[PDB]
Design a binder for these strands. Structure first.
Ligand code: NA
Ligand code: NA
Ligand code: NA
Ligand code: NA
Lengths: 166, 166
DNA sequence: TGTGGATCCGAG
DNA sequence: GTGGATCCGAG
């Protein structure tokens, strides 16, 4: 089982306003999870412009400390540009896999953003009703759909994608 | 006064075989100096392919230590990619202006070799009789013409230029 | 055959 | 506030 993690934040420096994962078993996506989170800092305007999550939405939510345990249960954590989420999240009990690094080894000379790959690779996932891009669970599905494409194409195991990831 | 310095070396790591310089005063090029130099090391064939200066040509020439002192006594020093000449030469007694950096700043999206600039700017200068690109005294005239044009176009001051260079 | 330096990229 | 990849100048 590979668990894709995505996160929304107050800015590039961190503070968590949302977290989500989907799990990947037998090349299928299952077991969606997502939580709005009460951050440790103001939500930057430039951040708010992106994910559209307001102070009002998170003010009654638990802290990242409180919420993270729900995401335990996985040897492997997959994140697009995993280095970000790795930094801004608290220490996870798995090992990491970055779908950005992998897509660059897999398909050199292309464009390497979550949404760029998804279009380029002409992919189609059953997306969650009612969330736009750069939300939380949405991008997980995009990233997962992209993880599947990547495994199918290369046949890479978990532990191979971990090592490549570095 | 601005002194344009150029150098032909044994390679990218150093080892002078030619120094040369010209001075810019009121947009005119004056006081040419040039010396074939005996390098502290073999002229790699890679470098020699460029400047076409043979071992024979420099066998009975002075060391760079007997010859640099002719080039001291200026407040400013101009070289194209100053950070090369600066590195391969003895500590020079002034302030440095790099025309490569000024060009990148003045004209973005362009190519930035001493000869690319010259052609792009369609500059015309009187180059010493029977020398050649990578001939030393030859590129000093080219770079002086570049400096001159940069100065016409930006109205930058010697001090402004150094600051830019960094 | 190396340096370095800029200069874009990814993540929000 | 930044770390990872490239590309480009000088001989
Ligand atoms: Na993300
Ligand atoms: Na996102
Ligand atoms: Na030079
Ligand atoms: Na030269």
């Amino acid at each position: 089982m590979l668990r894709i993690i995505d996160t929304e934040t107050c800015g590039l420096q961190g503070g968590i306003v949302e977290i989500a994962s989907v799990d990947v078993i037998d090349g299928k996506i299952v077991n969606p999870m997502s939580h709005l989170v009460r951050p440790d800092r103001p939500i930057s305007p430039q951040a708010m412009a992106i994910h559209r999550i307001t102070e009002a939405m998170v003010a009654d939510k638990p802290w990242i400390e409180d919420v993270i345990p729900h995401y335990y249960g996985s040897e492997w954590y997959v994140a697009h540009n995993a280095s970000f989420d790795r930094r801004v999240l608290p220490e996870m009990p798995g090992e990491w896999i970055c779908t950005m690094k992998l897509a660059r080894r897999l398909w050199p000379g292309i464009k390497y953003s979550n949404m760029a790959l998804y279009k380029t690779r002409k992919l189609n996932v059953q997306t969650p009703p009612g969330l736009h891009h750069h939300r939380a669970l949405y991008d997980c599905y995009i990233t997962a759909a992209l993880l599947i494409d990547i495994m199918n194409t290369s046949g890479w195991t978990a532990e191979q994608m971990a090592d490549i990831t570095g």
